[PDB]
């Protein structure tokens, strides 16, 4: 929902952590031109859990969407944004011609034409150093054997669909070493007391009758056990109340 996205050579990245990863709210936007996922499945993405999510946001020119993919090669892929060979995530792209275009030409977006070497995975390089095509120096201005590093996009509303500005958001889901923290929503049916039902409070799988009791736990304690290492009571994570766990009959 951002009002302005950065250029492809200066793509801005945001870190997502310590929250409920509800990916279903993404579908409320415009129909996505590309929703290719690698490794992960968009159908059950909310079921899995990850550690950190890198949201790479940038705008490219139409057909350049096919260049953002693990193992691709091109102008943008080698000098503006390079994905790793084992990327695990989804690439979301949609058209934004009605926003990132102006009749006089929206030259606010630029891209790096070339560099001396290819970019590393997730590497960012912003600079105004004039490229030295020849052995002669290129100080001051770009002479005959010199060229500017950045080039500007046109992004006029009259261009074809292959040249329209497309906002692309790349999400990363690699778990490096840390335990996962963003799993998403896990809603379920409400409580049912005075009847033997199966319970799974925070992973405590079992079967028993839930009933209220005066055994108020400590503010940091979650469940209780007896001398036989058997779970006797547990708190409701929705509304904090101690409920005993006893076999029905």
């Amino acid at each position, epitope marked *: 929902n951002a009002t302005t996205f950065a250029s492809v050579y200066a793509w801005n990245r945001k870190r997502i952590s310590n929250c409920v990863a509800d990916y279903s709210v993404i579908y409320n936007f415009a129909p996505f*031109f590309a929703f290719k996922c690698y490794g992960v499945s968009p159908t059950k993405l909310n079921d899995l859990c990850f550690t950190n999510v890198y949201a790479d946001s940038f705008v490219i020119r139409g057909n350049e969407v096919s260049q953002i993919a693990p193992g691709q090669t091109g102008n943008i892929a080698d000098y503006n944004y390079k994905l790793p060979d084992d990327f695990t995530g989804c690439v979301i792209a949609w*058209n934004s*011609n*009605k926003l990132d275009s102006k009749p006089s030409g929206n030259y606010n977006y630029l891209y790096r034409l070339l560099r001396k070497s290819k970019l590393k995975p997730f590497e960012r390089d912003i600079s105004t150093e004039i490229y030295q095509a020849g052995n002669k120096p290129c100080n001051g201005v770009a002479g005959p054997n010199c060229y500017s590093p950045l080039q500007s996009y046109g992004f006029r509303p*009259t261009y*074809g*669909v292959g040249h329209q500005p497309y906002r692309v958001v790349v999400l990363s889901f690699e778990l490096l070493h840390a335990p996962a923290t963003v799993c998403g929503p896990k809603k379920s049916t409400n409580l049912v007391k005075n009847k033997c039902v199966n319970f799974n409070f925070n992973g405590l799988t079992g079967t028993g009758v839930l009933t209220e009791s005066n055994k108020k736990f400590l503010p940091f304690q979650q469940f209780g056990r007896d001398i036989a290492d058997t779970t006797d009571a547990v708190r409701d994570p929705q509304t904090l109340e101690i409920l005993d766990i006893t076999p029905c009959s």
Partner: antibody
Amino acid sequence: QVQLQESGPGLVSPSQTLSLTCTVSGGSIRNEVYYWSWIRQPPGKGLEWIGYIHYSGNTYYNPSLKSRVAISVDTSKNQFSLKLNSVTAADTAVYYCARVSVGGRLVSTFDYWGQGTLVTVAS
Amino acid sequence: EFMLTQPHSVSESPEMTVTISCTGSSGSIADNYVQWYQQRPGSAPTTVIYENYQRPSGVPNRFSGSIDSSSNSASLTISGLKTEDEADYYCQSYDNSNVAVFGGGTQLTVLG
């Protein structure tokens, strides 16, 4: 060949909301032309551009008819409709739907047109 | 706004060189591609010239367009007009704000 079929009530009372439905035959609107526009023509007069809609939600309208023209699309039925609120006698024209080719460098190539239909603005 | 002006009526003897002109008023013609469409009475318009120099299949070679940036106008010259080409012609262009505009129309008439 790709054929279009206009549809809708041929008689609309004044000061009402006009509605016409155009049916696309021969494929689906994902990659074919990326654009489908409406064009009206008064009896004995010249053509008049209304606006096209993209399957991603991009809409463009005529500056003279911005607040009156409303365009929608349905990818499940492969049909796009044109809506016109508060119609009068001046809206007497034969409406056509046509596809616009955007695969080139610029928007152009109105290659196919529909059969067309007239809407009576009198009751 | 980019309005196009066309002569309302025109007529010429068959097998002669005819040229239909269409001029812009409030925009540069070289910014967008000008298209020409032939619309017979009681039928839908048919694409005649696209990309200002390209002609689709089935259209006779008599049709040929031209662009003049000096006079910000376009001209559709015909070589060897005949009765089968007697129909209306329109110049279609696009405004700088992605707004398509159709011309005023040109009524062609065959006297022969």
